[PDB]
Amino acid sequence: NRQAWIGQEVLRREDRRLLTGTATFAGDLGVPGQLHMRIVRSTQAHARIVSIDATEAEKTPGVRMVITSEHTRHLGSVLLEELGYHEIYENIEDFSHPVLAVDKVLYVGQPVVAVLAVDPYLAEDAAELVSIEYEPLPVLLDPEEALTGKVELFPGRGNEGARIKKAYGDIDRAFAEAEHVIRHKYVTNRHSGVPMEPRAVVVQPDPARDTLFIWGDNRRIIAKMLNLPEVNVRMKHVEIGGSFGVKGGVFPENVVAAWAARTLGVPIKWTEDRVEHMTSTSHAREMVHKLELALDAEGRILGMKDEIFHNHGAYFRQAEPLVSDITAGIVFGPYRVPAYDATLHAVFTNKTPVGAYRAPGRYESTFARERIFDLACAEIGLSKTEFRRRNLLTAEDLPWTPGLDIVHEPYHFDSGDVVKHFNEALEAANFSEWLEESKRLRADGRKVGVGLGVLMDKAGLGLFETGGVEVSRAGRVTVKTGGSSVGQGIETVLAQIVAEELQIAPENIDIVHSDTELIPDGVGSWSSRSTVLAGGAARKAALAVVEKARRLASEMLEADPDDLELTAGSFKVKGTDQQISLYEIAAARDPFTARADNDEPGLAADAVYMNNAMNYPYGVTLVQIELDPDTGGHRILRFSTSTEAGRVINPLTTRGQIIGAAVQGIGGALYEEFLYEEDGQPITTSFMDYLLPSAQEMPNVDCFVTEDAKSPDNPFGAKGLGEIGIIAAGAAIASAIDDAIADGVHTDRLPVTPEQIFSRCQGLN
Amino acid sequence: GVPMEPRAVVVQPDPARDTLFIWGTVHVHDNRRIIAKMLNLPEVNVRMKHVEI
Amino acid sequence: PENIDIVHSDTELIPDGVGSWSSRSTVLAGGAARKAALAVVEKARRLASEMLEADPDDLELTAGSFKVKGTDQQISLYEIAAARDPFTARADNDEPGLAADAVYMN
Amino acid sequence: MNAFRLTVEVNGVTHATDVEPRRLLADFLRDDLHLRGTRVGCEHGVCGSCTVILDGQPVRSCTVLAVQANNSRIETVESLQKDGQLHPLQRSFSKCHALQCGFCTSGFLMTLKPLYDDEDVTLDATSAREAISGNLCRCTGYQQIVEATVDAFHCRDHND
Amino acid sequence: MNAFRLTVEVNGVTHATDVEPRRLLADFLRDDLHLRGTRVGCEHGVCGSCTVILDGQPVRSCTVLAVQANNSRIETVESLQKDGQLHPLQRSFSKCHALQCGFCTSGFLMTLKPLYDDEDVTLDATSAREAISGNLCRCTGYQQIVEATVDAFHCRDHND
Amino acid sequence: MKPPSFDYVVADSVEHALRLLADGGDDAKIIAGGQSLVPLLNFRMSRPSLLVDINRVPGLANIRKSDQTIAIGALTRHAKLTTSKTISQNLPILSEAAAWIAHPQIRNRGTIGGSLAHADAAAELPVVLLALDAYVTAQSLQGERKIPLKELLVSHFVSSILPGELIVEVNVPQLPHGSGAAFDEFSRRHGDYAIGGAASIVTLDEQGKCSRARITVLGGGSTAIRCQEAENILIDSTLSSHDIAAAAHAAVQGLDPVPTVHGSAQYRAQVIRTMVERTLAKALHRA
Numbered sequence A: 001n002r003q004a005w006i007g008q009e010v011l012r013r014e015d016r017r018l019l020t021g022t023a024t025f026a027g028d029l030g031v032p033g034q035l036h037m038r039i040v041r042s043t044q045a046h047a048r049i050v051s052i053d054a055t056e057a058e059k060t061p062g063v064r065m066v067i068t069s070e071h072t073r074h075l076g077s078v079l080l081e082e083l084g085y086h087e088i089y090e091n092i093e094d095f096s097h098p099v100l101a102v103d104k105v106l107y108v109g110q111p112v113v114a115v116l117a118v119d120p121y122l123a124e125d126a127a128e129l130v131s132i133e134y135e136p137l138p139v140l141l142d143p144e145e146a147l148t149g150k151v152e153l154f155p156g157r158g159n160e161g162a163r164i165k166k167a168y169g170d171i172d173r174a175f176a177e178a179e180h181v182i183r184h185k186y187v188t189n190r191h192s193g194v195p196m197e198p199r200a201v202v203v204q205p206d207p208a209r210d211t212l213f214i215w216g217d218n219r220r221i222i223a224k225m226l227n228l229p230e231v232n233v234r235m236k237h238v239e240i241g242g243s244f245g246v247k248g249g250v251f252p253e254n255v256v257a258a259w260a261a262r263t264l265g266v267p268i269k270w271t272e273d274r275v276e277h278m279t280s281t282s283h284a285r286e287m288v289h290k291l292e293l294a295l296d297a298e299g300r301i302l303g304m305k306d307e308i309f310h311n312h313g314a315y316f317r318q319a320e321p322l323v324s325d326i327t328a329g330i331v332f333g334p335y336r337v338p339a340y341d342a343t344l345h346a347v348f349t350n351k352t353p354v355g356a357y358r359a360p361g362r363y364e365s366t367f368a369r370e371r372i373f374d375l376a377c378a379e380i381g382l383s384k385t386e387f388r389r390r391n392l393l394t395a396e397d398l399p400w401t402p403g404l405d406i407v408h409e410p411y412h413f414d415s416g417d418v419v420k421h422f423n424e425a426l427e428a429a430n431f432s433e434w435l436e437e438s439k440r441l442r443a444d445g446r447k448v449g450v451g452l453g454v455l456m457d458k459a460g461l462g463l464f465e466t467g468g469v470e471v472s473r474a475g476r477v478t479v480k481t482g483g484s485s486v487g488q489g490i491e492t493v494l495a496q497i498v499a500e501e502l503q504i505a506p507e508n509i510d511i512v513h514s515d516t517e518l519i520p521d522g523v524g525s526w527s528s529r530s531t532v533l534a535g536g537a538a539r540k541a542a543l544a545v546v547e548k549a550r551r552l553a554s555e556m557l558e559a560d561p562d563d564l565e566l567t568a569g570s571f572k573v574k575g576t577d578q579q580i581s582l583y584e585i586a587a588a589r590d591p592f593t594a595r596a597d598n599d600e601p602g603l604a605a606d607a608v609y610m611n612n613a614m615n616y617p618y619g620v621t622l623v624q625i626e627l628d629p630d631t632g633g634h635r636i637l638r639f640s641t642s643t644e645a646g647r648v649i650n651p652l653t654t655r656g657q658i659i660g661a662a663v664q665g666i667g668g669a670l671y672e673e674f675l676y677e678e679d680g681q682p683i684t685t686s687f688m689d690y691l692l693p694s695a696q697e698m699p700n701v702d703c704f705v706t707e708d709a710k711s712p713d714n715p716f717g718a719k720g721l722g723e724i725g726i727i728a729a730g731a732a733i734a735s736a737i738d739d740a741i742a743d744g745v746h747t748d749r750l751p752v753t754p755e756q757i758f759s760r761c762q763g764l765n
Numbered sequence B: 001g002v003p004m005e006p007r008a009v010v011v012q013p014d015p016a017r018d019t020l021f022i023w024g025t026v027h028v029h030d031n032r033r034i035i036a037k038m039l040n041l042p043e044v045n046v047r048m049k050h051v052e053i
Numbered sequence C: 001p002e003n004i005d006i007v008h009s010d011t012e013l014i015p016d017g018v019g020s021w022s023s024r025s026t027v028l029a030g031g032a033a034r035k036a037a038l039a040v041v042e043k044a045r046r047l048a049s050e051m052l053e054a055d056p057d058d059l060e061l062t063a064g065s066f067k068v069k070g071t072d073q074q075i076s077l078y079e080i081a082a083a084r085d086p087f088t089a090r091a092d093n094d095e096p097g098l099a100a101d102a103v104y105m106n
Numbered sequence D, E: 001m002n003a004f005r006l007t008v009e010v011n012g013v014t015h016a017t018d019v020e021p022r023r024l025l026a027d028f029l030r031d032d033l034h035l036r037g038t039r040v041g042c043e044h045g046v047c048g049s050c051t052v053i054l055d056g057q058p059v060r061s062c063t064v065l066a067v068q069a070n071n072s073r074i075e076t077v078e079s080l081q082k083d084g085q086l087h088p089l090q091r092s093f094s095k096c097h098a099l100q101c102g103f104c105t106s107g108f109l110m111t112l113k114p115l116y117d118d119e120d121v122t123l124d125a126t127s128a129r130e131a132i133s134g135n136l137c138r139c140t141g142y143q144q145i146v147e148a149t150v151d152a153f154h155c156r157d158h159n160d
Numbered sequence F: 001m002k003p004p005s006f007d008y009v010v011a012d013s014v015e016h017a018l019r020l021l022a023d024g025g026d027d028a029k030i031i032a033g034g035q036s037l038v039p040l041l042n043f044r045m046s047r048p049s050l051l052v053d054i055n056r057v058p059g060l061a062n063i064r065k066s067d068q069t070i071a072i073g074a075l076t077r078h079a080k081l082t083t084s085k086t087i088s089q090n091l092p093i094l095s096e097a098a099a100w101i102a103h104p105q106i107r108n109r110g111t112i113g114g115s116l117a118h119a120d121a122a123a124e125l126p127v128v129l130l131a132l133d134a135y136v137t138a139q140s141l142q143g144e145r146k147i148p149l150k151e152l153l154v155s156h157f158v159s160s161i162l163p164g165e166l167i168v169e170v171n172v173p174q175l176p177h178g179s180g181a182a183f184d185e186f187s188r189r190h191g192d193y194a195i196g197g198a199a200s201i202v203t204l205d206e207q208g209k210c211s212r213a214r215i216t217v218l219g220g221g222s223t224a225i226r227c228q229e230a231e232n233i234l235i236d237s238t239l240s241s242h243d244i245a246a247a248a249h250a251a252v253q254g255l256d257p258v259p260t261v262h263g264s265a266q267y268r269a270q271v272i273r274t275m276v277e278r279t280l281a282k283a284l285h286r287a
């Protein structure tokens, strides 16, 4: 008894909305009297301006207004980042547009002028007729060239970013006290999420002395910039079709809409062009890694070291530089790392401003390490596999409060690896491995590679996440959460968590989120967070309603008692002779002096909050590629990513996340890169140039490989999972490829083009 | 009473079925309580919106 | 009273209310507004004594702001609220009511 | 600038309306026909979501001007469910968790529809992958979609 | 069968649109010229709210087919306010609590407007009552409106 | 995303169509499938005055074994080219070559006529048809021209059709009883526009000798390219792996590929390939 919901494969709740076409997306929304906004974007990567005032735009009948920087710059001021640490240097500098520039332009894609028309067709029609005068300026593109003069983006003193360092232990005496010392410079891609739904915003004003309705919890910024609070929100629920952390938080488009909607009293709608997306929204992944590694004759780590240059694009969106702070923290992953120097540069170039793409800073760092490792396993010749076996964790030496300035991720305080044992994962997660080894039977199959992933999932986040549970009348329960449905099946995970604690089928739980009128406060869903956090809320609330019932349903009948048999949906009393249902309690107590539910997280002293939650997941990725030595095409024959994580709330949907995440990473490993011509012009703007993975190329195979080892210290002990699938997809492919020629682990620059696989007969000469 | 504004109602359903929006003027606009019970879809999910009367 | 806006009949913000009939809404809903505004003054004046370091006695205390002493310094009523951000909390009141109700008119 | 009188049968329902020629079929179907089921992701016949049944053949609602559909039958993801019941494809798509966001669902489902309704062929994992390949997704890795389609075709044919 | 093209000036902005002849001016001035300011209470030239300025003369937007208003200047309650500053009539109406609900406010205000703008006459309580009499209110009743109008005409003329 | 404004007229027949655009006119364009024109409009990369939808003209989607040739109407979808008369060791090669064109949903509305008059440097049908020594009859108001495929293909996105002059039919020399035909293509993603690809056909003299062979190239210059002198290397030969490799090595030496984000100049040319080598290989198998 009764049965269990948590840990069970339950068909998710969001499905039916999306399958039938009942599901509303921001772009689907229509409002009478609408103005369609088209934004005139930059065509120069770097330039000052002498804009026209169309005129010839405003002249075209059906055009109501054209917004220049004249309007938006007074005000609100520049976009406003977030909490609340990191205020240790002083930006602006950036944020982004902000909100429209009539001084300098800093990337092709930057919003300059917005038009407002009756239909979206007349919008783009008239936006063309706008003419902007430009004076080109020296174009920055390389992260290294960025910091060493001579060209500048913020011509004051600024001038090019933030410097983030972390160190402790003696790095150098470890480097002095070592035989073998290893060096190399790795360079990583520029991707983003590129989800299937482009950005979209609809704003409806209540022009009568009131508010704004917004469809598309960071109300907080818009409210502030417009000086419109007390909110006065009013963010409305719409389903989202892929964030991957790209859709982030506040954009320039977000605030222009609100301003214009406010100062006109006219419904304003904006839906993004795909070409716009590829040039306007959160870029990521672009990092350079200098890496020094010290070794004893045994081959254990004595310390890591060197510089990282993050190409933040042109401005500071979100992350701010949360990502850049995180990256400098966890380049060491899951290892014995006595000491290291980690110094990071957040730099700017004339490119689309950077946000937090799925596992930001983890794909990037995880590459550089598992590639500086394969290289030591080349230079000492010791086996690539048992290097990691010799040299990951301290099985016994846990808690492991790290060496260097750590944890500081992003901050306060500690931290360490208390999550389960590392290796008997790597050990046990080798179903199929060593017979995947038996190659070539002299052939053309060539590849085998490994990658490892710790994740600062958890990112408390934090400190809290609101929740709430309502049982009432008609046989259903309504759960309010601070989180957001983005596609990960959050509305289901909670539905299980609640159902388990409430003794009622999940087909009866409905979940409400992201309706700010209903939910006055909450954090979103970031760095693999909410299941522990927003689930811990739902538990706390569902644990409160049961005490509201099983103590004030004690009085509705006799007696205290207090009793055997706690629940089967109701409460049979002191034996199996009959009872009060759980809905009947709720049905009784509404006009009679009180209200029949709970939103226990939380009060002035917070709740639910799982506090600086550490909670580091971990695993391996295993890859076997086949190469065609000329053509340089490839067929990934076998793929299996591994993960140890807490309890795993739903096996079915967790599998989706893991598999899904990997394909994004594999896409990043061999398909996706934002390319730019010498003058800063973006090249990969359509879909034919930016290659997303398709059905045929991807492995028919992806092995779910999850293990429930020691649970952390956050109830029902769980972990973040929606970001671990991707982590190592870079490092494993690259090592697999270099094993696949061979001539040894000497690949740096990602992705891996077939033209690069033209080492073909430079293998014969 | 014969007031100047005659009676008027507007209902928009969220076919995601979760909810229902009523810019109708039902005069205790907190008597969704009746409509809820009647329709057997209670009790939030019948979210009432403010209008002038 | 210019700076004050009033929201009503929007059951997402207001999950529970009685309504308006039989010449009532002032002592009832105005009586609600009172002990709400009287819940902030404690939530605020208490919270303001912690913000500076002076205990809850001062000058007599209205601007709306907070004059301790006579006549050095001051903390406005809005800055108090703006300060209670995501610092572990929340800067508001809604005390009517619970089990054994509120407002109480019987 | 002179509107064209269009006549189209959508999901059995006939329609008569003036449209300007330049309006894309996708935008016509969404507005004012208010079937948001059809979704738009790319803008040049790639993303997939775009996809609709035109006269029995799956085509992109986004590389076709609305005016080009005059006197023709069109079906969207809205037409699948009949009388509360989800059409087998949708049912198995949920059974295998073949969707996450929602976007790449109209596209795939409508591509698969005429293939389903016609008596051949089987769809095995390999031939299944090639079928959906005309549609892109950024969430599932197709693995489950490929698994989802296959399931739909087994309860279809070899049914017990 | 029959569409009609309107060329009407409304509150300054000229509009061109095709409307079916039977649509009443009131309905036209609220859709799709979303100027909800004009309000509709009775349905036969009585309630008052209905009232709009047509070509300088106050007429009921409700006993006039929208089509009859072609090539004419029309003004509604939206047109009083000029850059934030409420038109004095609106001010004295609030200064004297001449309105409680809102409905009988477009009607009266628009009735009083051309009377105001033209240099004559004074409006004393007796002549004030006769002026507004073409509009009904169920809330005031009139005492304060009559008091409101008079006030508006004193700051107008003798004015310190 | 949104197109510019333009006018639209449904063509009832060939002549009536040819008339409709002429007086249109000047920069009036015809529209069949839409699959290249409509995307261009969405990018506002072509702004015509009026469109003439020939897509409903009744006598233009035919397939015919006519005489010594095979007749194909201009409105013939690629979708049909995959599943058709295409039998008899006279496939002859098309359904394999038309199979590489994107995805079913595009193939379902695309037409052979338009695909030619558009003529992308990576358009597949031209490459494979030039290997079949194609013959396009482009009827216009004044007369009826017949353009060999060597002359039709001018440049990237450019054909030898004077404004007007609508492609009506495509004819092909039937070939060869008996012979072998194969087409292959390389692209980072299947169905995408290729980096490099080849179309080669060989006819064999009883038993092992060869009598005639024709070879073409995708991604060569701005158009499909005859490898004429590589063909002479093949002809009269044993067809070993010593003449195929030699033919291919000489089937490339004259090319000027244009670099792309996916392709370096020499790579592209070096990816003209072994597309030749394995296409010639697959041409021969008892075929």
Ligand SMILES: Cc1cc2nc3c(=O)[nH]c(=O)nc-3n(C[C@H](O)[C@H](O)[C@H](O)COP(=O)(O)OP(=O)(O)OC[C@H]3O[C@@H](n4cnc5c(N)ncnc54)[C@H](O)[C@@H]3O)c2cc1C
Pocket: D044, D045, D046, D063, F030, F031, F032, F033, F034, F035, F036, F037, F038, F039, F074, F100, F101, F102, F103, F106, F109, F110, F111, F112, F113, F114, F115, F116, F117, F118, F120, F122, F123, F124, F125, F165, F166, F167, F168, F191, F192, F193, F194
């Ligand atoms: C995602 C995607 C991938 C694609 N991949 C490929 C590919 O790999 N290879 C490939 O070859 N194509 C590809 N195409 C498109 C390709 O151009 C189509 O096969 C072709 O456009 C079919 O449509 P159509 O011939 O009717 O020309 P449409 O553009 O559909 O119709 C109008 C076009 O016909 C042209 N035209 C001019 N004169 C005539 C005439 N006399 N008769 C008929 N039409 C004429 C016009 O120039 C105009 O461009 C792809 C398209 C998309 C959206």
Ligand SMILES: Nc1ccn([C@@H]2O[C@H](COP(=O)(O)OP(=O)(O)OC[C@H]3Oc4nc5nc(N)nc(O)c5nc4C(S)=C3S)[C@@H](O)[C@H]2O)c(=O)n1
Pocket: A195, A241, A242, A243, A244, A245, A246, A358, A359, A457, A484, A486, A487, A488, A489, A490, A493, A524, A525, A526, A527, A528, A529, A530, A531, A532, A648, A649, A650, A653, A654, A657, A719, A720, A721, A722, A723, D099, D100, D101, D139
């Ligand atoms: N069915 C599930 C879903 C999630 N989780 C885990 O529990 C937490 C609940 O999810 P959430 O708090 O939303 O995690 P994130 O905020 O990090 O978002 C999920 C993750 O993975 C994603 N999956 C996505 N899937 C779809 N279809 N669309 C997106 O936009 C998605 N965006 C994301 C993004 S962003 C990330 S980073 C996550 O740590 C996740 O790892 C789980 O155990 N079981």
Ligand code: FES
Pocket: D040, D041, D042, D043, D044, D045, D046, D047, D048, D049, D050, D051, D060, D061, D062, D063
């Ligand atoms: S978006 Fe129109 S076809 Fe993919």
Ligand code: FES
Pocket: A195, A196, A241, A242, A487, D099, D100, D101, D102, D103, D104, D136, D137, D138, D139, D140
């Ligand atoms: S869930 Fe985002 S596309 Fe499938």
Ligand code: FES
Pocket: E026, E040, E041, E042, E043, E044, E045, E046, E047, E048, E049, E050, E051, E060, E061, E062, E063
């Ligand atoms: S309703 Fe038209 S005048 Fe009263």
Ligand code: FES
Pocket: B004, E099, E100, E101, E102, E103, E104, E136, E137, E138, E139, E140
């Ligand atoms: S009409 Fe109700 S207040 Fe005057």
Ligand SMILES: [Mo]
Pocket: A244, A245, A356, A357, A358, A359, A525, A526, A527, A528
């Ligand atoms: Mo994320």
